[PDB]
């Protein structure tokens, strides 16, 4: 159960482990991964102009803070056969910080 974090450390966590494939803001370019704007309160594989794996669309989960934290532990376990080649944010306070920044930077 995620509760709160620091969008300051959450930003520095993103810049090192997320920024290579992703972009936040409104109207951000699709790089390797999709643009994460408005991800919270939006179903998996709904970003316009991006080609997702069948599995990402199959999952059909409304992205919430609890759904995201379970996913960011092991992305390949939560969604099997996904093209997100990321290990995972194992340390919970790392996820809690990231989601706090991600809940703000995705609007």
- Where is the binding site for heme c, in residues? 18, 21-22, 84
Sites for ligand HEC among residues 25-84 (CB under 6 A): 32-34, 39, 44-45, 47, 52-53, 56, 72, 82-84
**Can you tell me which of 10, 11, 18, 106 binds ligand HEC, judged by CB under 6 A?**
18
Q: Rule CB under 6 A: is residue 21 a binding residue for ligand HEC?
A: yes
- Least distance in angstroms from the C-beta of 92 to ligand HEC: 14
**Can you tell me which of 66, 85, 93, 107 binds ligand HEC, judged by CB under 6 A?**
85
Contacts 24+ apart (CB under 8 A), 45-53: 53/81, 53/82, 53/83
Mark the binding-site residues, compressed into ranges. Answer: 18, 21-22, 84
Write the DSSP string, the chain. Answer: ------HHHHHHHHHHHTTTT-B-SSSPPPSSS-B-TT-TTSBSS--TT----HHHHHH--B--HHHHHHHTT-HHHHSTT-S-------SHHHHHHHHHHHHHHT-
Q: Which residues bind ligand HEC (CB under 6 A)?
A: 14, 17-18, 20-22, 32-34, 39, 44-45, 47, 52-53, 56, 72, 82-86, 98
């Amino acid at each position: 159960e995620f509760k709160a974090g620091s969008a300051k450390k959450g930003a520095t966590l993103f810049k090192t482990r997320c920024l290579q494939c992703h972009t936040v803001e409104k109207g951000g370019p699709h790089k390797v991964g999709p643009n994460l704007h408005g991800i919270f309160g939006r179903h998996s594989g709904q970003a316009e102009g991006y080609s997702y794996t069948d599995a990402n669309i199959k999952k059909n989960v409304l992205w919430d803070e609890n759904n995201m934290s379970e996913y960011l532990t092991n992305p390949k376990k939560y969604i099997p056969g996904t093209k997100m080649a990321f290990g995972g944010l194992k340390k919970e306070k790392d996820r809690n910080d990231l989601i706090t920044y991600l809940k703000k930077a995705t609007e």
